[model samples]
Target: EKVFFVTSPIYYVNAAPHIGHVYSTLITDVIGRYHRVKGERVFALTGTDEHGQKVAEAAKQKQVSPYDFTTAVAGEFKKCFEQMDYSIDYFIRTTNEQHKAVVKELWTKLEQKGDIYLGRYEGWYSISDESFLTPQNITDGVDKDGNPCKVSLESGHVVTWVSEENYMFRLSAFRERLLEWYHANPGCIVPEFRRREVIRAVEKGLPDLSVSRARATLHNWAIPVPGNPDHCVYVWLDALTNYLTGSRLRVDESGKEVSLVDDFNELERFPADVHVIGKDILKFHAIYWPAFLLSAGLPLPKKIVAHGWWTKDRKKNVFDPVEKAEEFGYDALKYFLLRESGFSDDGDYSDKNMIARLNGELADTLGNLVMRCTSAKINVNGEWPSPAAYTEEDESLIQLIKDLPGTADHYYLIPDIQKAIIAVFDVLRAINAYVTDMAPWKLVKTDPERLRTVLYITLEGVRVTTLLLSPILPRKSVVIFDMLGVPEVHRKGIENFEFGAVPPGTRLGPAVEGEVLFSKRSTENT
Candidate 1:
């Protein structure tokens, strides 16, 4: 069986979960679900990054232990993803004992490979990002109180000057190797521009990365460096090892632990097929992570997909994801995020925009279509109506449905979910247009046979579309499938997504009276 492995960035546990975190997790879920629909064995991983100074400080301010702080925040993240129905296979916490062991093992591996060395480091470090910045990446900025301070150019977060003795990774030595890898693998880093950005940075110069912090400075709140009590692993190093930790450990059906490292020859999932992350951290995943893996003699992930951020009023938007899920429904929120936000560019969020998408697209276009097609008044028999003959109108609609999977498959393969969604909606728009032109409701009495043809074609369009959209709107798609009476067997794979797949005269569990998949919401009140 073919295998697909996808991951979301382990979220930082310094704060509560928000829209940005949900977007990243949803993207991963959608991609994994898409692959599963195509019949691939998929492993999807998500979790929290809990071992950083930011998290420690947050814990201190809250008057709680870092362990307790992380545990509580990690629970929030888990609950948010679960409540929103994200299909995550495993959740790896950085504080997990096995994960700590894996990080130490990786540290030892890199050290033995001569990629790690002790060094005195002095630079500008951003606590919020937990990233070290060179002079060029820092700028003078004014804080809220109007005092001048050094800040990271990327995130505009204040940077503190730090000088300490720490362990360093020989990242400079991997420049040529990293460039060669990029040259060899086209499209490995997505949005073409992000790849170019990384290449430009590497071409400018490669700097050795600080791989550890003085243990005292971290207040002993991190993974200790192997055989070195004076330093703890750099948060990024500890965090990135999570991907490996998940791949190496497994539980068998017999409830016994399995370690792929002990059987290194069979580590099939080591090189993740995709890493879906925010654009802000592209450098870490595209450059630093690959260097780490290369130094450890591990295969690099196949692709780094960097998505843009969601903004509101020209500031970082902190929309409460769980609250939104409750108010608008998970599938509706998922649809709005994916449909409205093009993966490569920043997206603006507002009550008006989200409401417009949910009401206009989901309720008006899709829900209305489904309700109209399956109305008891129109389809009095509550069964799949067999078509007598194909008219020009019927043939046109049928052909569009037949070609949808192929059209949408191309975009889904590129993982351009917005385009794939647009494709699905475009066909839906045409189907609605076809229904209008055919006047199926009018034909119910005048031309009953023609009505059957029109209704069958419309419902078939709904079936294929629901299949195409199952990855993005899993729950809503289930409701749709049930209404159409599509058996579990029929809903399994994309290969079965075809016109006329449902046998004529098959009983349909149509919706109850006045059913609406997505109820319209008032943006004014919100």
Candidate 2:
């Protein structure tokens, strides 16, 4: 089995999970399911980033300790994702004892390498973002109190001039090395354009990064700088190391805990196969995080995949995934998301457009095909008909079904999930055309054999199509599988995934029965 590790960036627990947060994890889950069905030993990670200045203040406002506050919010995250039926393998927390160990391990090695030093710094900082900014990154904006003030160009959060003493990482030293790494791994970041953006930034030059903040000023709410008790490790560094912590590496603190070496040692090494993240934090993951790993002589992640955000009328908006799924069915929403949006480009969403894809694609195209094929009127005898001699229509329909799994496989390997979904629809459209052209309804009385062949062919096509779609629409696919008399094992593994092998006489249905897979959402329903 191939070893595959995938992770959604640990979300900040400053707030409960939102639509963007769910989307990040959902994308990773879909990819993990695809690999899993192929029998890969897949480990998928997701969790909350609990140590941050925002959490500290948010906790203060609620009159609770930061630890208590983040714990409650993190609990809500777990509940929220679970309710959405996310298939995450492990939920990591930066506050985990083992996680903190991993962070310290990284800090100690980078320190021994002479890459860390204490320094006095002065610059603009955004408390709302828990990030520092330079003049180039500042812009005019209305502040939290509605006063006009300078804010961060990236986040539009208020920024204030500040001065402090901090520990720093020699990020500037890796300028040439970062370019070399990116060149060596040509498509390290997906969506081609995003990769170019990171490359441009690295080429522009990197400055040594501030790695710590004064503990008293930060309310002592973050991980402490390993040796210097007066400073807390900055939030980004602390948060980023959670990736390593989730790997279950054995450490050597001897009396302390454990030990480690280059790239976290072979026995416990799990450099991520990919990090599924949103577009906003691309620079931190692509540049700052990788530079820190190089400083410790560790292997970088194989890929950093950033997806674009959903919008409402060209402005940022949130659409709750679970809520949408509850209203219009899970697969309906899943299909809408993967089909309607470009995987790497921003897209707008609205209930009206969702209703369009649901009524047109899910209901009319896919669901109608299944219901009509299995109806008593067409499948009069209610049995899996043996294959008859090939008609031209039969041959081409079979050919399309035979080629579909491989076609979907190509796009799945592209990791272009949207394209993979479209590939499935390509087969759906083909089946619709085959059935319509065959006119099975017209032939059922005059040409019973041809009718059986046409209906059987369409039903078999639905069988495999549902199998192919299981990774994206698990719940609905399971329902369709039972209606088709498919064995549970066939749905689990992708081995022998090609067609012409679906057991020629498998039963279609004794009148396949179920409520409509997608209930139409008319304007009246809204």
Candidate 3:
């Protein structure tokens, strides 16, 4: 079995999960499920970044210990994932004993080697972004609480000014090597534009990253300072370690316990197959993450994918009009992020755009096609029509039915799902074009047998599409595929994904039609 490991950037429990939260985790879940279905050995990890100044403030407001606050927030995260039907193999929290021990072990070695040290200097910081910014980063905005907030110049985080002494990771030292590594892996990030952004950062100088915090200010919630209990592992450093902790890849305090605990000395390690993160935290994953691994002498994650933000068109006078939203209120938001958007490029999530896609793609084209096929066939008989040879139109569709499953596999497995959308849309275009030119609806009268044959071929096209798309749009796609008589998730490996697999005269039908997959919301309401 090929080892397939997946991760999401550790989420800070300072706030409840958002559409962004679901987006990143959903990507990992999609990839993990896709790979596992293809018979790969899949180990997926998702977790919380439980320690930080943000957690500190959140704890104070609730009048609870930092641990209690983060624990509750993490629990809420667990609930969100469950609600979304995520199939992750493991969920990690930095507060776990394994995480603390692993953090200390790694810090000790880095400290002993003189790569880490106590340092004091302060700079502008963004609490919201969990990063420091120069004055340029601050923007005029308000926090959820509606206070005047200074967002990170680059990351759009809420910024602050502080000066203190803390242990710093030797990030500046690795700039040259980091650049070289990016060069070595030109496609390290997807969508191309994101790679340029990282390269821009490299062109600018990198500063040493602060990796530890004084106990009084931040350590109260963290694993005690690696050697000095007065200091604790800085939040991001500790959180970053969870990728390894969650994967059980790095040998640390667990080496004896996990191996001796389970008595499996050969503790398995699966390097992360992909790390899905929002673009806001690109530096942390694209910069800090790889550097930390290099310092510890570990292999890099297979890929670090930075997804675009889902922003509303407030500027365009569009907004979500519900007075208050339930956790599930943003169903349309979830659909676009999970299905419509691709990794690497920015995605617009305004009211107009969302409704447009819901109308154009989901409802109008794909949904209607499925409904048309099954509605016609279910009453006719839920099985293959008699074995019949292809017509000119049938042959054209046969060629597409031949190509589409592999196309879906290629785009999905490579994590280029946007291209997969084009493939499916192309199939829709083919079917529509065939019908428009051939007038199958008209054929039902003058050429009844020919029309039957055309509908048969069209239904076959629907079968190929529904099966191929089951991974991306699982619930709706499955309803269509299973009604077409498919019983599985229908994933294929990047290596052995076979196209043209639809057998002739395969009994298909019983489709549950007329379901509203997505509908165009009236912008006039807003």
Candidate 4:
């Protein structure tokens, strides 16, 4: 009856989807999938954020108009998700008419609140950061902010001094209220440190934000002001409106992927449950976003979780043709983010480091365990292992199974996938240890009864894993469930899940695999 909505920051199509972008979308996909399995009404949206000066310059350099460049990548981002088996509900483009209407509506609301004032925006703009440069983030060497200091972004956009008249959003007014909202809802921002970081960032306070563009001088590729068709909206403002415009909250139930409730302002979903993003834009999501919503009389997003950056692997041979850390294997990078980082924290994306995690963690630990149980069962009996009774180890794992609903719900209900990932791997490792100790193969005949129990425990371990991992790896997780012959059950949230969903005598086969599932990557190759 209720709906769950999740979003990945619509990427700025200055370039194609990169490792960092994969991490963000992967995290959201995991959360969305998890909710879907729990049978929650879900609408997951991901797309390109294509409105800015950087895009204008990048497009020109590539000999394409900003509109054409962003349009191409908008589809490209969708392709990236499709390749990754990411089941996103809506791929929102800021260029879409529906998106424009929503943004325009918000702008109108802000104007009514007297928050939209015409003013001169004079600050050191970081085209790379796509933000105003404060005197502090000015690093020296390459991206430093001084005379002849190339823009810190090195995005090829010239950042010469300029003065432009623009509309402003009074972001400074809601500082105290933002803090109070976060404090009241401690879980509002995930990973306590990220919450602390955001709160601390706000504690320093926010300045007024540049919201509108002047009539003609810079009416590049942005949405025009709600009433004033001459000028355009600022990139950030246009981009932020994405949360509202592309949001499925206000739309009608069209029997479609998106929830667009027509003619009803009271459509349930609004104020996004969580926004998992890269840490680089904390000020935008946590600081300015809430301020804008409050001024427009809209409820703020419950939380904005910013994950860390992916760094280059100096120890490995995976050279970025571009030489930047963000250009690693998108799949490997996606797994790492789901594995190691949380929405509120940053993650390092070293290729050597990534390879290590892939091999030892994915191949050696998790996959090996899956192989062990699967191979052992089919090897001995040529079918999925039966649902045997419990032993001490079996019972222990069953107890853990009991906790998955709660453990996993912490991640999905609030939609904090970082927590879900932590719990998933932790459970996987524990089962692997138990498998090693039990040695189901050795015990197959030696201790017939115990072996059955141990193997059954492991089988159910796989079973429970299906429910937990369904969000991140939808097709794969479901295939796993199918292999165990688990029935059609919406085993998503804890309250809604049925622990005994697997039937007593259901049959299964291992070859019922789905998709490429995971690429057959190896450590030595990296």
Q: After aligning candidate 1 to the native by TM-score, how far in Å is the CA of 449 from where it should be?
A: 2.3
Candidate 2 collision pairs: 251-258, 251-259, 252-258, 252-259, 253-258
Instruction: Output the number of the lDDT-best candidate.
Output: 1
What lDDT does the true structure give each of the candidates?
Answer: 0.85, 0.78, 0.67, 0.66
Candidates 2 and 3 compared by TM-score, better number: 2
Over the stretch 54-129, how does candidate 1's per-residue lDDT look in tens digits? 8999899999999899999999988888888887788788998888988988999999999999997898899888
RMSD, every candidate, angstroms: 2.6, 4.0, 5.0, 4.8
TM-score winner between candidates 1 and 2: 1
Off by over 4 Å in 2: 249-269, 310-318, 343-346, 509-514, 523-526
What's each prediction's clash count? 0, 5, 5, 12
The candidate, 2 or 4, that scores higher on lDDT is 2
Q: Write the per-residue lDDT of candidate 2 for residues 1-526, one digit (tens) a residue.
A: 2358788888878766777777778888988888887777777888888887778887898899988988999999888888888677778778877778778888998999999998876998877666777799998999668889998887777888867889989999999999998999987888778899999988988888899988877788888888789998888899888778766644333312243333544544368888888777887789988999999987798888888862101235456777887888877777777777774555657777788888988888888887777777777665556667788868888898888888888777656788888888889999999988888788878998777778778878988888788888888887777766677777766664766445756765444345677677775553
TM-scores for all candidates? 0.94, 0.92, 0.83, 0.83
Across residues 160-271, which tens digit of lDDT does each residue of candidate 4 receive? 4447887888888888899998889887775577778888878998788888766554536778887677678877877877777555433335423344444223545566
**Model 3, span 1-526: residue lDDT tens:** 3468878777888777765676678778877777765677777778788888777877888788886788889988888877776777777888888777778877876777677877974888766555767666577877768888666656455677778888888888888989988889887776578888897887697888888767887637777875587877778778888877765543344222241122111334445778877777777788988888888777787687777753210122332222112322343344555655666345576556767766766777887776655555331555544434567657877788677767777787567756776787789868866766767556645766565666666666776665555556666665676655643533244432343344445566444355444545564644
How far residue 289's Cα lies from its native spot in candidate 1, in Å, is 1.0
Off by over 4 Å in 4: 136-147, 150-159, 248-267, 310-333, 342-355, 372-393, 412-419, 490-499, 510-526
- Candidates 2 and 3, the one with greater lDDT: 2
Which candidate gets the maximum TM-score versus the true structure? 1
